[PDB]
Amino acid sequence: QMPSLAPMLEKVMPSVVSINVEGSTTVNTPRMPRNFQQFFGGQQQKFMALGSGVIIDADKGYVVTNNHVVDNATVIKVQLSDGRKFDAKMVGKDPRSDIALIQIQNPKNLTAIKMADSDALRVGDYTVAIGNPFGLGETVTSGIVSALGRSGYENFIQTDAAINRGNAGGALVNLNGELIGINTAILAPDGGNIGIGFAIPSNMVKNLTSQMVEYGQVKRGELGIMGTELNSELAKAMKVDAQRGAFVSQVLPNSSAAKAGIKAGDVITSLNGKPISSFAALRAQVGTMPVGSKLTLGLLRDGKQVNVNLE
Amino acid sequence: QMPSLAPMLEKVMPSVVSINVEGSTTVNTPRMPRNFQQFFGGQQQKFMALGSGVIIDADKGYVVTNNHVVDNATVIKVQLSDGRKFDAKMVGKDPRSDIALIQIQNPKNLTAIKMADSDALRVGDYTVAIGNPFGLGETVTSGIVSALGRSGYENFIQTDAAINRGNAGGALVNLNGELIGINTAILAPDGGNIGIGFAIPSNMVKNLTSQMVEYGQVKRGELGIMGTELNSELAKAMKVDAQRGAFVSQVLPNSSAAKAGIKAGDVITSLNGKPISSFAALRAQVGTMPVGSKLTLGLLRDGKQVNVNLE
Amino acid sequence: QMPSLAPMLEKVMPSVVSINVEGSTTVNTPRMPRNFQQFFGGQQQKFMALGSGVIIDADKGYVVTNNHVVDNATVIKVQLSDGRKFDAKMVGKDPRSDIALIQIQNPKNLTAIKMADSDALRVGDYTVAIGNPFGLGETVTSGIVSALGRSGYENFIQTDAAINRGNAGGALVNLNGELIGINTAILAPDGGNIGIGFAIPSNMVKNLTSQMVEYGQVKRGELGIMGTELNSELAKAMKVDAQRGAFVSQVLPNSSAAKAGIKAGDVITSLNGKPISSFAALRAQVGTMPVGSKLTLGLLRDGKQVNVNLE
Amino acid sequence: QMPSLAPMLEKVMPSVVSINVEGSTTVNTPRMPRNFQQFFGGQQQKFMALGSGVIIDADKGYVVTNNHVVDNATVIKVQLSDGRKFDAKMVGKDPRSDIALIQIQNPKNLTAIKMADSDALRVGDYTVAIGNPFGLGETVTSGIVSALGRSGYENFIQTDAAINRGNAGGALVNLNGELIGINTAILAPDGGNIGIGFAIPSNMVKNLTSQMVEYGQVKRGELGIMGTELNSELAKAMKVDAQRGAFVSQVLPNSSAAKAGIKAGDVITSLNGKPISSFAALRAQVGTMPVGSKLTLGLLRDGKQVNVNLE
Amino acid sequence: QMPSLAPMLEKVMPSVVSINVEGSTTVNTPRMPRNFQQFFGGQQQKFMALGSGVIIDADKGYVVTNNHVVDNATVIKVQLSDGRKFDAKMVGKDPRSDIALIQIQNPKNLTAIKMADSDALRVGDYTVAIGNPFGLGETVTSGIVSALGRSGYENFIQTDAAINRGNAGGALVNLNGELIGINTAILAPDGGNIGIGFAIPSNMVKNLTSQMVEYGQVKRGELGIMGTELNSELAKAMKVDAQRGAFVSQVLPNSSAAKAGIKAGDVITSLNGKPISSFAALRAQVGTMPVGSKLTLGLLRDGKQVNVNLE
Amino acid sequence: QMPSLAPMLEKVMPSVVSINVEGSTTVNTPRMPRNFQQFFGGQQQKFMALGSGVIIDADKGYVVTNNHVVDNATVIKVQLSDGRKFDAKMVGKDPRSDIALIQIQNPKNLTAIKMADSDALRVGDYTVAIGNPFGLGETVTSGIVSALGRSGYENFIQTDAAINRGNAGGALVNLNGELIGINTAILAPDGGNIGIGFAIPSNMVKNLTSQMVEYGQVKRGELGIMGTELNSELAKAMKVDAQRGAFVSQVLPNSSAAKAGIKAGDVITSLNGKPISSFAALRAQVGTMPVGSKLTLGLLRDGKQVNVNLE
């Protein structure tokens, strides 16, 4: 009969869960009377966040979701599409990528989703998102892969399968029902839309996620080598023929420098396209990123640009 | 050659009509001069509404549309996709579901749409909407069934096939060209979008619609039985072991109570999920609904929850 | 030397006090994540209100202030212009006129202000207001009496001595340092300005205030007589020559009816200018007012309009 | 006793009247449903304007007011401060200066105000305004002369005696109760405040007003002489030593040119300060002004600047 | 395996290019201090526009894009999806249809897109748009043909394949990878969305584009014949039986009048639906359009309506 | 005759000058097309600021004004109320108090204003402000001293003589024509009103101003003594009986510590009322202030609070 996504959706929905968060946050004591004609400017306030997650490990009962949903939580509950409810405890979170991991207490008869290798994605691929944009429940929508933050190096998937005025729900799945990414919120504190959706790709979700299980957090790889700004003592001494950039004096730490095929003298000025002005420009950009990252540095020395792997 | 919806659209469009409403409304006499720096605060004012409808009965020439389009109308006109124009008179309207019925005067060579049984819908099904979001004409758009207010009990279809910033047009149709619902406006007085579209499902449209033909209106089923609040004389007397809710003293009226499998003593506290706090909470929620409704009541008495059918 | 208000201000300021309110209020539990692109929609929340008051009785330590400052208070503190602080307990409040009365605990060496008879005010009289518009402290400002809600019958003083974008402070005083009114907030919940200031005149403040001491509240005088709508049985029977209004059948209750010089048959259609359309129009307008009121009723019977005194 | 303005106000108020306008205007037929998420885009609509006026001629019953109050009026009513009401017919209006003149029908026992010579005003002089900023009635406020559009040549009086967020009321009067100007609305269509008030000075009001009685309108004095742009045939031929401006070829029309002490050759480039760029710049600025104007032209010819008097 | 658009996208992307514009514009000199509480009111300012284009002629290196992207450009650069960059010079632009043409300097190994005949489009056809809505790069999205400004006479394609809050990108392509239209911006100065996308159809793009190559501009066809308004001398003389419209006296110019099958006497009152009120109404509407246009005129003379072809 | 301020204003205005600033500032290169539905995110841009100043030294030609008027200036011009214009060069500025000093080039026949001792001001004193709120020129307004940041210790004068929606003009003068303060802008970058005006008092203006002449800037007095936080090694060792505050270990620097009557052990927790929480809380608050300041510290040691004088 008629083509439909219902068939695969019925095999995927059991892996998608609903998350009810109850948390408290420190807030300013309201100053009054309230005068709506004035530009003005501590107590605990209870809040209720809500969102979606995907079951990533059925035996352990690990569930990936968004940090903007589970942040400051005090009690978190989970409901499977069948109706069953469980308690869950937090296991790790990451404000930068807006990814967080939770663990179901007493997991039983759970179905984990199969994760696809995101490195295989291509722009015109079809995608469907599964989330909760208005708090009314699990809503599913479809579209295609609009942009790839690499294939088309610390990527991001842009998809037109994203709901207007809604909160970046949960799962981004392909036609075979496999997880290709988790939809996130770029404008964090505000689960919100920019007009198109962004998602961490599944491989990154997997990497980010194994780290939270192993360390309670994702280890930041802030790692240059030990260099000296351009125009300084040991820096100016050399080339300076096509100057303007971030100089690199040493490389011995052997931190993806004896691996980056980088040695003394170099002068990096790129990090996936954006020109690396200063030297600290580098120290910062390359340090706020998640271990295992694959960023690329356009290096100067008359031909040189390799890809790094954090750690 | 290439896949297209044009083929089925050409078999459906003849059933979709354009509605031009001319009406008058009572308005406040403007107070002036107008000072845009002030927060301030009767005559008849002519207005022009516009919208879409679907031909539901070709011999009778019955056309379903939205109450926010035909409300306060004084003259209503209809244009078929072929160009022909007819006059129409109102036959019934319903602000709650935003559905209204009109009748074409001198119907001739009309094509009614075939209505599908909406109980068969499933979330990943494909849908296409046909309406007039900007007043520029008949615009068609497609997507899928994002949520079902029951299948996934007084449902609602949520579809991502809904235009941004537009007025909830008319028809919601499936791939075989059959009516699966009429797109409505939840924010009534303002044909508007919340970010995703809602539609009354076809079966409800059919029920709602037969009622307007038969009574000029949809009969409200406000029908409990005759009970007595919880904690009162005849209520407190019993159980009160797992209290907190709406008590039910009698059931003899035999109004889906001798049918709800409900008898004296009970204590209902649900109506499709939302906890029934008070007793009037019940009297109100279950009374504003359209006859024939299928709502469900989570009843307390240590195991009891049946589905009702208004009347 | 140079003219100044400082001289009289130094004799008045000791009567003007600062009020620090600490209160709790029931609020909605924040729903999140917060999406600033959505139109959405219980716990106790502590708040801090702030305002001004005037010492009206030094022995008893009675202080008049605004109900929008002391509403929902749990702890109220008072600081005299000299620095001394006292605790105060609430004694009465009135949302309608925005007036409230508080009592200082352990009053000692207090100076009450002298109240002037407001019936003597005239439009071009000079006035000075003393309050706290931004929370920064006691700010004084001057101007004149811009309008009188009677002299120029349940008056109101309009004064151009009112601060832009500020909260209607406290006292309105004349050139001899006497209280002529308390500045209030017409837009209650929002201590705010409309562009000019309003104040309850001192005589009303005095009346309103004696009532809160005597009853914990100001007694509402909802008192017609016992009549019967116009066009009804006993109403239509009579005149109806210059109809259109509120009929009056009886008067025996002797409630400012045997005092209003009103008797059976009458047909009132005025209440200080505004035409009294219906009969309940009267029942409502004349019932929300504070006892002792002096409202006027343009009565129909070919010449008749007297002034009433509630109770 | 205490200083007050009440004394003089009681001698002035009888000259200040209240104006109730009932008018109709051509408006767009509302297009619906109304979607508040859309940027969109004829019938007669009745409106009610309201404002203040001053009695300028008691025998004739001439009343000056604002054109933004009486524009498009169909019925105009007038109430004296004593309560009496009269009908009035329009006699002239002027959108440019926002001044209009009306005539009372059956004037009787009227008191006209005495007009002061505005040429005598000085910045620190005291002023009081009398108007109706919120529609609540006659409100009076005071302040000083903040700026003079000449004394400090087609002046304007700026006064801090102007109400926040209100509609530029009516009269501007000095301490002896004499009219020194009518407060106007610079932002016409919106009786509104810029933060300080503007008023046509009394002498201009008098001139503007005598013209409306005599012609139904104020005659525009668009009058150069007949010249030829700078850089043209007969223009470039001469000087051009300190060029850049508006050339003047002829002067024979004898229109304040044989009076402006202006003759062939000249090159005007000023009109009360603002540099006269082009030649039409002059034709326009000097033509939209009211006859009898006293504008000044900084003329070039190595020393030349005289003041003109329209006509 | 799974259906995808990636396959055809890989054959199309090479034809889609990125355009970086650097231009200067005349702007007002900022007046300060900036007071955000005031409604206020020349130098050159450099700006940077950005957008998309499609390679329409590989040998010549002609690239079509939007006039709102290339307007006021001083330097324009182009990057092919492979990374190569070229300089380009402007060749023609058209604010009305928002289409502009540029030429690549030193074109080499370029792939032009194949253009489809837009006259063949039908509403349910599938479409995909390729553009740059946020400046982040080339983003592709899909949907269907929602409306046709003719097929369903100076058409426009409306497509739901348009990104929310983004700038109308570039190309609109069908499933075989052929250009069916260029997405434009109706709200010009603001690359922006109305909620659905508009595009000039490919045939018009082709016509508009050949004109800019041949004349530096698209020649406007402002061409009636030479008639005389309705009710005038030679107009009223005739019929006037079903009057109300634009009269047509002559036709001899032979400008699609000896071609429009139009002769003396006629009275046109239509231009693709919209009633032609006045005679200049016609002169204007039919003159702002692009040569080669196919507009239709509902002509009066008891049966007459032909389609014109500009020139 | 009638009271007026004109008399004294004529003796003061010659000291008040008009300042025309022409400056350049570094700004972001506009990114386009401009999409008003997007939340987005270097070149020199010329600006024109405008404001008022007061002649403080006639021989030297020193003029005080606001830093928000003269900041980033490249050319500054000055016009005396008589018409004469001079060039001026900057001599010092201070963003904190918004005061700046300029010097007239070729001063000649200048009249300096006489400065009054601001320590003598009292709340009900009369004041008049002279400035340029809309750019239209010199506007004068009057009112009274509403609040004193000390008399009623690093004061501020609050005056109701401040124009709505305008830029804090220049001079604040008393009835004898003497400077009592310069009106400033608290919301700096935006010459703007909060609803009432603030002014640096004349004595501070004098102190601030002598410093800019002597050092090009006002020397910041960041000066504690050298102490050690509360709860630390040498701090906890002592008292701690009524703890909670900023400890003070040493005092030997003799910086208003051997002058503050302060010695080892102390524990300051006040700075003119506001409780000094931390120790750095002190280091910061007392360091951003202008030398010569008179701030007061509520010191703990069972009775101790003296006033300091920076340096």
Residue spans per domain, chain D? 15-23+50-117+203-217, 118-202, 219-311
Task: Give A257-264's long-range contacts (Cβ < 8 A, gap of 24+).
Answer: A257/A224, A257/A225, A259/A308, A259/A309, A260/A297, A260/A306, A260/A308, A261/A304, A261/A306, A262/A225, A262/A299, A262/A304, A262/A306
F45 contacts E46? CB cut-off 8 A: no
3-class secondary structure, B300: strand
- The residue written with tokens 């309230």 in the block is A34
CA gap D63, D107 in Å, rounded: 11
DSSP reduced 3-state for D164: coil
**CB under 8 Å to F310, separation ≥6 — which residues?**
F221, F223, F256, F289, F290, F291, F292, F293
Please give the backbone phi and psi of residue D67, each rounded to the nearest 5 degrees, phi first.
Answer: -60, -25
Tokens of D121: 């005003």
- Comparing CA positions, the residue from D257, D292, D259, D277 lying closest to residue D94 is D292
Cβ count within 10 A of residue F81: 17
Name residue C290's amino acid.
Answer: P
- Chain B within 8 Å of A9 (Cβ-Cβ)? yes
Strand-pairing partners, residue A305, are A298
- Residue D250 has phi, psi (to 5 degrees) of -110, 180
8 Å CB contact between A92 and A100: yes
Report the alpha-carbon distance of residue F291 to residue F311 in Å, rounded: 6
Q: Which residue of F has its CA nearest to A195?
A: F38
Closest CA to B30 of E236, D156, C154, D23: D23
| Collapsed DSSP state (helix, strand, coil) of residue B119 | helix
CA distance D146 to D156: 11
**Chain B: closest CA distance from residue C37 (Å):** 10
**E147 has a chain B CB within 8 A of its CB:** yes
Residue (of C160, A298, A40) closest to D131 by Cα position: C160
E strand or H helix at A101 = strand A99-104
Pairing mode, strands D31-32 and B43-57: parallel
Q: Tell me phi and psi for residue A54, to 5 degrees.
A: -125, 135
| CA distances (Å), origin B121, targets B97, B118, B124 | 20, 5, 9
d(CA E59, CA E57): 6
Q: Which helix (H) or strand (E) holds A172?
A: strand A171-173
Output the CATH code of domain A118-202.
2.40.10.10
Cα distances from A198 to residues A101, A189, D114, E137, in angstroms, run 19, 15, 74, 14
Other CB atoms within 10 Å distance of the CB of residue C72: 12
The CATH code of domain A15-23+50-117+203-217 reads 2.40.10.10
Q: How far apart are CA E183 and CA E172, in angstroms?
A: 6
Q: How many CA atoms lie within 13 A of C274 on its CB side?
A: 10
E194 near E186, Cβ under 8 Å?
yes
- Using DSSP's 3-state secondary structure scheme, residue D72 falls into coil
Q: What six digits make up the tokens of A191?
A: 């689960």
| Close Cβ partners of B162 (under 8 Å, ≥ 6 residues apart) | B129, B141, B143, B168, B183, B193, B196, B197
The sign of the torsion formed by the CA atoms of B155, B159, B162, B165 equals positive
Terminal-residue alpha carbon distance, chain C: 53
What method did the depositors use to determine the structure? X-ray
AA letter at A239: K
Question: Residue A306 in contact with residue A261, Cβ under 8 Å?
Answer: yes
Question: E strands, C157-274, where?
Answer: 157-159, 171-173, 179-184, 197-201, 267-268
D201, with CB counted inside 10 A (0-12, 13-18, 19+), is buried
CB F270 within 8 A of CB F298: yes
Contact D32 B49 (CB under 8 A): yes
Query: B206 CB contacts (<8 Å, ≥6 apart)?
Result: B115
Interface check for E74 against chain F (CB to CB < 8 A): the answer is no
The angle at the Cα of D99, spanning D219 to D311, to the nearest 5 degrees, equals 25
Is the Cβ–Cβ distance between D99 and D184 less than 8 Å?
yes
Beta carbons of F4 and D122 less than 8 Å apart:
yes
Give the Cα separation of B159 and A140 in Å (integer): 9
- Kindly report the nearest CA distance between residue A66 and chain B, in angstroms: 21
Mutate to test the interface with E, among B127, B138, B140 (most CBs of E within 10 A): B140
What sign has the CA pseudo-torsion C203, C208, C213, C214?
positive
Chain A CA closest to residue F187:
A39
Q: Which residue's entry shows tokens 């068609």?
A: B140
Chain F residues with CB under 8 Å of D122 CB are 4, 6, 9
Sign for the CA dihedral angle at E144, E146, E150, E152 comes to positive
Instruction: Decide whether D15-23+50-117+203-217 matches D219-311 in CATH topology.
Output: no
Rg (CA), chain A: 23
The most distant pair of C-alpha atoms in chain F lies apart, rounded to whole Å, by 75
Parallel, antiparallel or unpaired: strands B197-201 and C157-159 = unpaired
Cβ–Cβ pairs < 8 A, chains B and C: 6
Distance CA C274, CA C297 (A): 10
Q: From residue B206, how far is each of B115, C38, D289 by CA, in Å?
A: 8, 32, 69
Please give the Cα distance from E183 to E176 (Å, whole number). 18
- Whether the CB-CB separation of B197 and B220 falls below 8 Å is answered with no
Residues B151 and B201: their CA atoms lie apart, in Å, by 12
Three-class SS state of C299? strand
Rounded to whole angstroms, how far apart are CA atoms F63 and B273? Answer: 74
- Chain D hits for F2, Cβ within 8 Å: 125-126, 174-176
Distance of CA D201 to the CA centre of its chain: 8
Q: What is the Cα gyration radius of chain D? A: 23
Spatial contact of A191 and A68, defined as CB atoms under 8 Å apart: yes
Nearest CA in chain B to C38: B194
Q: How far is CA A285 from CA A231, A263, A276, B109, F81, in A?
A: 21, 20, 9, 69, 57
Cβ neighbors of C125 (< 8 A, separation 6 or more) are C144, C145, C174, D2, D4, D5, D6
- Residues E299-302: contacts with CB within 8 Å, 24+ apart? E299/E262, E299/E266, E299/E267, E299/E268, E299/E269, E299/E270, E300/E242, E300/E245, E300/E266, E300/E267, E300/E268, E300/E269, E301/E239, E301/E265, E301/E266, E301/E267
* The three-state (H, E, C) secondary structure of chain E, written as one string: CCCECHHHHHHHHHHEEEEEEEEEEEECCCEECCCCCCCCCCEEEEEEEEEEEEEEECCCCEEEEEHHHHCCEEEEEEEECCCCEEEEEEEEEECCCCEEEEEECCCCCCCCCCECCHHHCCCCEEEEEEECCCCCCCEEEEEEEEEECCCCCCCCEEECCCCCCCCCCCEEECCCCCEEEEEECCCCCCCCCCCCEEEEEHHHHHHHHHHHHHHCCCCECCCCCCCCCCCCHHHHCCCCCCCCCCCCCCCCCCCCCCCCCCCCCCEECECCCCECCCCHHHHHHCCCCECCCCCEEEEECCCCEEECCCC
What gap in Å lies between CA B132 and CA B115, rounded to an integer?
Answer: 21
Residue D148: CB atoms within 10 A of its CB come to 18
Residues 6+ apart with CB under 8 A from B172: B127, B128, B129, B157, B159, B161, B179, B180, B181, B182, B183, B197, B199
Secondary structure of chain F as H, E, C letters = CCCECHHHHHHHHHHEEEEEEEEEEEECCCEECCCCCCCCCCEEEEEEEEEEEEEEECCCCEEEEEHHHHCCEEEEEEEECCCCEEEEEEEEEECCCCEEEEEECCCCCCCCCCECCHHHCCCCEEEEEEECCCCCCCEEEEEEEEEECCCCCCCCEEECCCCCCCCCCCEEECCCCCEEEEEECCCCCCCCCCCCEEEEEHHHHHHHHHHHHHHCCCCECCCCCCCCCCCCHHHHCCCCCCCCCCCCCCCCCCCCCCCCCCCCCCEECECCCCECCCCHHHHHHCCCCECCCCCEEEEECCCCEEECCCC
Give the span between the Cα atoms of A204 and D46, in whole angstroms.
66
F126 interaction partners in chain C (CB closer than 8 Å): 2-5
Q: How far is D270 from chain C (nearest CA, A)?
A: 39
Is A6 an 8 Å CB contact of chain B?
yes
Nearest to B154 by CA among B264, B301, B310: B310
Contact criterion met (CB below 8 Å) for B123 and B111: no
With beta carbons less than 8 A apart as the criterion, state whether B15 and B83 touch: no
Name the CATH superfamily, with its identifier, for domain A219-311.
PDZ domain (2.30.42.10)
Mapped onto helix, strand or coil, the DSSP state of residue B285 is: helix
Cα–chain center distance at D176? 23
E strand segments, chain D: 16-27, 31-32, 43-57, 62-66, 73-80, 85-94, 99-104, 126-131, 139-148, 157-159, 171-173, 179-184, 197-201, 267-268, 296-300, 305-307
Chain E CB contacts of A123 under 8 Å are 5-6, 9, 140
Q: Would you say E284 and E223 are in contact if contact means Cβ atoms under 8 Å apart? A: no
Nearest CA in chain C to B39: C194
Kindly tell me the sign of the dihedral angle through the C-alpha atoms of D287, D288, D294, D297: negative
Tell which of A1, A140, A167 to mutate to test the B interface (max B CBs under 10 Å). A140
Strand C197-201 to F16-27 pairing: unpaired
Residue B227, Cα to own-chain centre: how many angstroms?
30
Please, which residues have CB within 8 angstroms of residue E292's CB and are 6 or more apart in sequence? Answer: E207, E211, E221, E309, E310, E311
The one-letter amino acid code at F23 reads G
| C-beta pairs of A11-15 under 8 Å, 24+ apart in sequence | A11/A177, A12/A113, A12/A130, A12/A171, A12/A173, A12/A177, A13/A81, A13/A130, A13/A138, A14/A80, A14/A81, A14/A82, A14/A111, A15/A54, A15/A55, A15/A111, A15/A112, A15/A113
Place of tokens 């008639």: E227
* DSSP three-state, residue C223: coil
Cis peptide before C253 (omega within 30 of 0): no
Q: At B75, which amino acid appears?
A: V
What part of A 157-176 touches C (C-beta under 8 Å)? 165-167
Q: Name the pairing type of β-strands F43-57 and E267-268.
A: unpaired
At position D183, the amino acid (one-letter code) is N
- Give the pair of three-digit tokens for residue E94: 């058209």
Q: Which residues of C touch A134 (CB under 8 A)?
A: 38
Measured from the Cβ of residue B226, the count of other Cβ atoms closer than 10 Å reads 12
d(CA B294, CA B151): 12
With H, G, I as helix, E, B as strand and everything else as coil, classify residue D2: coil
Q: How far is F169 from chain E (nearest CA, A)?
A: 11
Buried/exposed E109-145: b ≥16 CB within 10 Å, e otherwise: ebebbebbebeebbbbbbbbbbbbbbbebbbbbbbbb
Q: Do A28 and A69 meet the contact criterion of CB atoms below 8 Å apart? A: no
CB of C270 closer than 8 Å to CB of C244: no
Q: Is A82 exposed, middle or buried (0-12, 13-18, 19+ CB in 10 A)?
A: exposed
Q: Amino acid identity, residue F142?
A: S
Contact (CB, 8 A) for B104 and B54: no
Structure tokens at B22: 């001319």
Instruction: Give the dihedral sign, CA E268/E272/E278/E279.
Output: negative
Question: Regarding beta strands D305-307 and E16-27, do their DSSP bridges make them parallel or antiparallel, or are they unpaired?
Answer: unpaired
Given resolution (angstroms): 2.8
Cα–Cα distance, E305 to E136 (Å, whole number):
49
- Distance between CA atoms of residues E268 and E286, nearest Å: 12
Q: Are strands B31-32 and D43-57 parallel, antiparallel or unpaired?
A: parallel
Question: Which residues on chain D are in Cβ contact (under 8 Å) with C194?
Answer: 134, 165
